[PDB]
Amino acid sequence: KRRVVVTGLGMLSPVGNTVESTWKALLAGQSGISLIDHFDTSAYATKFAGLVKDFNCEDIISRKEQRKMDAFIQYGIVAGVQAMQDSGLEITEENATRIGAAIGSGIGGLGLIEENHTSLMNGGPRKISPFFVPSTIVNMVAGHLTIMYGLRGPSISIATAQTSGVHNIGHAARIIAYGDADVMVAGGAEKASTPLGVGGFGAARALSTRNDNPQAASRPWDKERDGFVLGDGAGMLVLEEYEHAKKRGAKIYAELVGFGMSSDAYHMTSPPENGAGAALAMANALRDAGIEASQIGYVNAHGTSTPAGDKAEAQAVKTIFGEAASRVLVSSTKSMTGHLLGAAGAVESIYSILALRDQAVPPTINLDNPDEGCDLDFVPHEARQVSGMEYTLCNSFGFGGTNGSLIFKKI
Amino acid sequence: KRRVVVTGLGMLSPVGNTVESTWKALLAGQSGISLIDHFDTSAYATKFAGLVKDFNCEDIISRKEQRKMDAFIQYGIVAGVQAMQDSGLEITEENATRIGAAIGSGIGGLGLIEENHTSLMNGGPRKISPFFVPSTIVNMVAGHLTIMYGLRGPSISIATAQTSGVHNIGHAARIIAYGDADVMVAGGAEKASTPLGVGGFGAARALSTRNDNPQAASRPWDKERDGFVLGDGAGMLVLEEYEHAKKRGAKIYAELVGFGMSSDAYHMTSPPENGAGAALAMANALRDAGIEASQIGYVNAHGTSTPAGDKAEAQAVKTIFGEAASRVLVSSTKSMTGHLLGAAGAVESIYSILALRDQAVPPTINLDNPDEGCDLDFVPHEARQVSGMEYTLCNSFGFGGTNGSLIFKKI
Ligand SMILES: C[C@]12C[C@@]34C=CC(=O)[C@@](C)(CCC(=O)Nc5c(O)ccc(C(=O)O)c5O)[C@@H]3[C@H](C[C@@H]1C4)O2
Ligand SMILES: C[C@]12C[C@@]34C=CC(=O)[C@@](C)(CCC(=O)Nc5c(O)ccc(C(=O)O)c5O)[C@@H]3[C@H](C[C@@H]1C4)O2
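A: This is the predicted complex of the input protein with platensimycin.
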């Protein structure tokens, strides 16, 4: 009966270009939200986002190859390299077959979609790049990485919008636990800070508009919430079978204990007031881990800072925790990080891991005035030390009412 | 130990708007390839594709809701309804939780991407539709369908480009076999016959250019091959646990016996001459099914009619079959159907099923002059009756060297 453990991490976030730097920033309650400058935001109702600062891949990706890939792919490859390195794993002809990847994204190569389309409109199909398809499609991070590292085991790419990160990690673990693979690099990558991404979610009325204070915009559960904030980044974890990792003396961050999925069956871009769907997703992860809601010390909420969304998740926590409801710590890193969409669940799974290694829980900043009727401990303003925390749970929910929860156990 | 069976089918193809009509057409060796008329193809090097003829959803989707979804979503929903109906399954409050979906697509809502982008370029972010995101993203078919049918179990969407259909079906079966679900609607949907899809794959030099004979264009293994042909469609199958299906007296088309995945780790848009990757994918499906290459009576090849691609797959068959190499029937439905990308593996999984029900195997049309050095029986020109065939295998390969194989067993 195969157990899965995390033996490698990598990340690119609006608050740091490494795992450690990003963790540091979050515990210090820093914000990565800034004003956009790569395109004219005049007509845009939202003019800020959590961007990746001074990105550099020169040492990892030839500017020759960079031409064949959208920022989202570029990000994910870098985070994947970080993870592969940090794992210390060495690919051998024996190995190849039993190592793979499960990496996706919510929207994929918007930027190159826009470029290629603009080109076509201005000068015809003659102007489309031969790399249009391969540079924009969601599965390309798994593509480039399996090639770069000679990985030959199972490779998949789940695109469940804002739920992607959690699904890729969850299925990567299943692939391993099932016997199909021994190691899996998994997570997600996103870079939707484009005219289309901003204008698009902007058109749905899903974005915050607090342009006077981009850092105060993302405020989960606070009463002045006005919609989620966009974030770019990538998060990746090397998942590996317990005995395979030991046999190689791998540093093991944590164990992946439970994975749960659910479907809202309600509305395409909104959850029930009731949070029924998030509840089942958490409820199935517990049952998969074989433990009780009482044992969860920390929950990394999906908490996107949308009026209807944050309320639903809260509702669902009460429902699952009941008694403990107030004794469990809950927080949204999105208060500082922004919403990474297809990468949200990857980075947050990383934070849910480090919170067990460091027995510390990052805050929900901007939580000035909670929502009324809230019994929950949303860890507002300042990180919080914890005692004997053995399990953390991570939530991701997405459009189409698709939900997922991962449960991590210490050591 | 949970077995998975197919208890429902649905389809939209360039040769038929139902399962039965499409099967009929294929066995008769008909072609669905035609010249494009929905956009000006003057500047286009490829001017044809396998389109879905006289699509109608009026009875299933309100023109009110149709506004919120790309053709690709519209197609997939219809095929999903067909499948749900054909399964005879009835969703009950008990049920909901244990029924879900695993549906994806290669490229998603290109058409609405183009519309929305054009709008933005012509009149600003003000012109983007509030439905931009929800109408174009890959996971929306699973979204709309879980809602329409009150499905609350696990919902996922794998986007592994041209390998998608096989992956969604394969993982849907795993979800079931693992205990996460009892029923899963699974497959894929595509509609890339757009300026971007045509110009895009056209820019990669991956499309056939035989505009003088659109019906002769798709010719897997033939010596005058000139690249794949684009096809629109959707294919869906209801997968369900054996005892759950029996307990309800479900008509059972076949059993899903093996699922295999592999990664080429070679090139982003091309397979090794050696076909090493396809071999492992087939090789793992056999091992998963617990049977031998000898027992496979029919193989539905990925056979896309690209020079480098068809050769690689052939190579891989020899490698896996060896002795039997000539005693196993191999064929490409893409000779008539075109390439459905993210939906290819769904429809072809359907054909791999019916070939067991009807003990008949559809031909590879246009196979005038094989490639030299080929020992394989590619079932050229005319469908072929078969005797005691108990297993069929279905191949899907995609960009990023991602591969997958499904193995179906009679009854
Ligand atoms: C039609 C409306 C109704 C509206 C009303 C109140 C709201 O609060 C929002 C802004 C968002 C509802 C929501 O929270 N959706 C939601 C979700 O279901 C799953 C994931 C996420 C995520 O970001 O990962 C998410 O954002 C909705 C959205 C946009 C528009 C305005 O739908
Ligand atoms: C850079 C080049 C080299 C080139 C040369 C010879 C060829 O024959 C083609 C046209 C296609 C190779 C190929 O077969 N790729 C391939 C694949 O790996 C997996 C799936 C599929 C599918 O359609 O599901 C597929 O199409 C390639 C493509 C385009 C361009 C011309 O890469």
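Chain A has 14 helices and 14 strands. Chain A touches chain B through 83 residues (CB under 8 Å).
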